[PDB]
Structures are given as structure tokens and as C-alpha cells.
Subunit: 335 residues, 2 copies
């Protein structure tokens, strides 16, 4: 059923940036100026949100200031794509104040990751328009060559180019999560050979829903969290956490019946994971929480904090094959 | 609403470690805690994971559940007390023997991460549980503060108390991050007050505990539903401004503040204000957006010393403007 979608990105389009949380545009000026320059050189225009350059310690501004910033982008018909500068923690503060009506009356590509999950999922829940787990300006497009160019490839392939369906999501050949080269480059990140992991064999087809699991706990139960439906594919990712923290998040899903409903799980890589001396991988901890319940599971998916990043539409039908390690998007996410 | 028997001198406290393996990593504080209580006249029965170690946790999901279940089903045990928190009590929730607890109610006590179990048993059984002392942090503390925490623990659980039961504020507190295993100096006596953040009175059933933890059980059958007129009791410890903003807004977008008649906010041990110089209550006031909810803050039922033993799931009367809290409903036999 033809069910409304944002317009594809085009060359020359204006991308609106906003800072719903951490004031990265103040604290990391070089990476920010670099990220801008990367996309401008590709041919896009950037429209700097009203909190760009601003500093309120752990945030860019008050809840009202940050809502006002995003709403001004949302109301702007000249903006085609709205992208967070970075995450943090405090995106969920904005949810009561977003102009959802405005967004529904002029759908745009909404993209970001990490803490922006609150907003991605909030907008999708209120408006039904799919949104995108993908690049945030500073971390993603501020990355030095070579990785930036793959992230950019995926960003273009999914939001600008036309794609016949089923659309296959190709595994990046290389990845990294090295904690270097933030503001200044000091050596080439290692180009590590990449793979996804077939943790539990099987196939599932269903609507993909998820994002950053830690952020989800900040919106769970509210009108801004979509209800997980029978047959959904759960997409989850965390970054720079430890084993205690993720066990809690996994058990949180378990005690909420999420794993009774989902047909399959896609787990992103865990940037800089701290296993607390256990040597356990995040999927092993999840598997203990799953207990005797068998669910097709594909891990170390490259849609998270690690580089490169894939752009994943949320709220659309996907097919995951955990045994052969494939993901295809089965329904249109843009027009 | 059935109720547990009051503690008595001579009873046995059963201890368990639903998360962090503190009896392994902190043997001196542990021993000291157990000796303090033995001296008072209680026995300690030591959970089957006592002394075990699995890095960030005491043991597997199944083993921790079995450890608590053995205590719940032991008729010789009057009080079940966590050794410490951590992060992972919520993992046990599917495996706990709620029906045995219900058929033989007893005192369930602890704080921090143990909120997952305090609320889950209450959600499942309707039996009141208690936000209060965990063995190692609470009773392994040195003088002077451990004796005030013990005074409160008797007042709620052992003493025969008339209704309404008045919960008094201590003279002095501390949150100094020293004297864990061994003493080195004395902690600073910080002079106390509770904070009339937003004036008013409210009477209603008290629900909450450690807010960070609550986000690990929210929306599940183990989280009691917040009803119209409930008093929200929330506490966080050793977090930062960003973290508690998220949790406050999490309550807001879930409609909690449309329903509760009052709030009671704990002190925030070693709070990190990220340079803002803002108090947690001020962050909460921003999130509240001028909604008029009576708000009493810096309540001493949290990670700071000393700690009050507060019942959960019972009628409470709070007066934020005159800084009083009374328990209005019987919580033990």
C-alpha cells in the first residue's frame, strides 16, 4: 500500500544540520569544519541550525532552544534532508515539542544515529514516515579518507540513487573502530578485513525497527516509541559500553516480550566494547539472555559507530538471511 | 495486601548478590558488614554465590536466580538483603519464584540496582518491599554513619510503629568517596537539609526507587503501573547532568508527571554537573516546564550516608513545604 515517503536527495540539495544534544560544533571545530567542507565539495548546501557554534556544557542549549532549532529546519521547505551533528544523550527531551504535523505535511529525509534514535523513532511513530539510521555530520562526514568515502557511497546509494527492489545491502570490505584521528590525523587507521557474523542460522522477513539500544530505553513506553509487532526484525546497536550495561539492555528487551515477537535480530558492531575481562562478545551475552529461545541472528552489522557506516531505512520491510549473511530492503523508502 | 513479619533479634538475614560480586572484590567491607549485624543480634545466611566471581557479575543468569530463590523458599529466613547493586538484577526477573514469596511474605530490602527486584516482587505479588540497606555498602560503612543507617533500619523493620509513622531527617550526611575497604580519615560531616523545591502536599501510594534502574524494567510486567495520585520517589547516584536529563525526560514523555501528585527526589551522590553548576532538581524543574508538582529534594534514601529504610507500595503523605514524610499505611506485621 503506497504509504507516504520523503523525496530522494538530489545534487545541490540543502542539508539542514542540528544539534539535539552534544555541542560538537563548538567542542570539535576542526572535525565540524572538515565535515562541512567534505559535503559542500560534493555539491550540497548546508543550512546551519540556530544552535550551531553554541555551547551549554553537556548540551547545545535548553530543551526549548533545541526543539526550536529542529522545528525551524522541519518547517523549511528549502531543506531536503535533516541531519544531526552528533548524538549524546538528550534528544529525548525534545520529543514533546517537535512539530510532527509540519513534518507530515512536508516529509524530508531524517537521518542520524546514536542518541538521535529518540528522534528517528519518535518521528516515525508519530508520522509513519520512514527515517534513517545513518550518518551524523561530524562523526561520519568528518572522518578522514579512506573510510569517509565508503560512508559517503552508502549515503548516496540509499538516499540519492534509484534502487530497484529487493535492494541488497553490501558488506563493507574493511572497517575500523580506532580511537584516533578525531580532530587531527596522526596515522592511517588500519583497514581491517570485515565480516558479518552468522550467530544463529535462519531467515526472517519483516519490518525493521530499532536503532541505538541504550537510547531506546529513554523513550520506551511512550507515544514516541513504535510498538514492536509480531514478525518485526529488531535492529539494535550499542557503542562504547561494557558487558554489564548491555546485559541490562538485553534483559530489558527480554522482560518486555520483545524477543517473543521479533522474527530476527540484526546486531551492529560494538565500537570499543569493554568486556569487563570476560572476553565475551556482545552476541554471546545476548545469547545467554535468549536462553533456550532460538532466533535468527546476524551480528557485527556495519551500522553503528564503527567506520564505514551504512544508511538503513527504518520502518520498512527487510529480508535478513543470517545463514548467508544478507540484508535486502524490500519496499520503497523514498520517492 | 499481605505483609511480612517484622524483623526480630535472633532472626536470619539471607543475603544474595544479584549483580556485582562485591563479596569477592571487597572482602574486608563484607566481613565488617556481617560482623556489625551479628553483633546486633542477627544471623546471616550466605547466598550460594557468596565469594564467587564472574568479572562484572556474581554468576550466570540462572545461578543468580537460583541463589535468590533458595532464600525465598527458606522458611528460616525473615529478611532477604542484597549484598550490593550493579546493573544486572533485571536479568533474574523471569526466573524468580514469585508464588513462593507470596505464600510466605518476608522482608525484601536493598537499593540501587536491586530496585529491579524490589519493584518486580511488588508488581507481581502486591507485597510491600523496602528501599534501604544493602549489606556491604550500607553496613560495611564505618562509624559514625553506619549507626544512623542502622537506627533507621530498626525503626522501619523491627520496632513496633504506630500510624502515621514519621520519617525524620538526619543531622549530617556524607557522600565522600573514601573508606571503602579501609579507613584513612573521617568523612566530612555535612550538615543536612531537605529542599522545598516546589511547595505543596500530596498523599498517595509511593512508587519508585533508583531511576536509572527503572529504565531497565519499564513497560514490563515487573514494573508497577504508575496510577493517578501516586507519589513518585526517585533517586540517582554517581551519574551526570546529561544522564539525569534523559531519565527525567523519559518520565515526562511517558506521562508520569501527568499522574503523580508529588515527587520525592533523593540526594545525588558524587553528582557530575558537567560544569553547569546546576542541581539535579533544577534539571528536573526544566523538564517539568512549570508543571506544579510538590517536590521535596535531597531526601536521604539513596547512595549518600546515612540511609532511611523506606517502604514501597504503601500510602504516604508528603508535605514539600514543611519537609515531612509520613507513612500512613501498615507495611509489616
Amino acid at each position: 500500500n503506497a504509504m507516504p515517503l520523503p523525496k530522494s536527495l538530489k545534487y545541490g540539495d540543502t542539508i539542514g544540520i542540528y544539534s539535539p544534544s552534544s555541542p560538537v560544533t563548538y567542542t570539535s571545530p576542526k572535525r565540524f569544519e572538515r565535515a562541512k567542507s567534505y559535503l559542500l565539495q560534493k555539491g550540497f548546501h548546508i543550512l546551519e541550525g540556530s544552535l550551531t557554534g553554541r555551547y551549554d556544557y553537556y548540551r547545545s542549549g535548553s530543551i526549548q532552544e533545541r526543539a526550536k532549532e529542529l522545528n525551524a529546519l522541519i518547517r523549511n521547505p528549502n531543506v531536503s534532508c535533516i541531519m544531526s551533528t552528533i548524538g549524546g544523550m538528550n534528544s529525548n527531551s525534545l520529543l514533546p515539542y517537535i512539530d510532527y504535523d509540519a513534518f507530515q505535511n512536508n516529509p524530508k529525509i531524517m537521518i542520524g544515529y546514536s542518541d538521535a534514535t529518540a528522534l528517528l523513532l519518535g518521528i516515525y511513530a508519530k508520522t509513519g514516515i520512514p527515517t534513517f539510521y545513518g550518518p551524523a555530520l561530524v562523526p561520519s562526514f568528518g572522518e578522514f579518507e579512506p573510510f569517509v568515502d565508503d560512508t559517503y557511497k552508502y549515503f548516496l546509494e540509499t538516499l540519492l540513487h534509484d534502487q530497484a527492489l529487493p535492494y541488497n545491502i553490501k558488506q563493507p570490505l574493511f572497517w575500523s573502530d580506532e580511537f584516533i584521528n578525531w580532530e587531527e590525523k596522526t596515522k592511517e587507521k588500519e583497514l581491517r578485513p570485515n565480516n558479518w557474523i552468522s550467530v544463529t542460522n535462519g531467515q526472517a522477513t519483516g519490518r525493521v525497527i530499532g536503532g541505538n539500544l541504550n537510547t531506546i530505553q529513554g523513550i520506551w513506553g511512550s507515544p514516541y516509541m513504535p510498538c514492536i509487532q509480531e514478525g518485526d526484525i529488531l535492529f539494535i546497536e550499542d557503542s562504547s559500553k561494557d558487558a554489564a550495561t548491555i546485559e541490562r539492555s538485553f534483559s530489558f528487551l527480554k522482560i518486555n516480550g520483545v524477543f517473543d515477537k521479533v522474527s530476527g535480530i540484526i546486531l551492529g558492531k560494538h565500537e570499543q566494547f569493554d568486556d569487563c575481562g570476560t572476553n565475551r562478545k556482545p552476541y554471546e551475552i545476548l545469547l545467554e539472555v535468549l536462553q533456550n529461545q532460538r532466533i535468527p541472528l546476524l551480528a557485527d552489522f556495519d551500522c553503528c559507530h564503527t567506520h564505514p557506516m551504512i544508511t538503513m531505512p527504518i520502518g520498512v520491510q527487510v529480508k535478513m538471511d543470517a545463514t548467508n549473511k544478507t540484508i535486502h530492503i524490500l519496499e520503497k523508502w523514498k520517492i
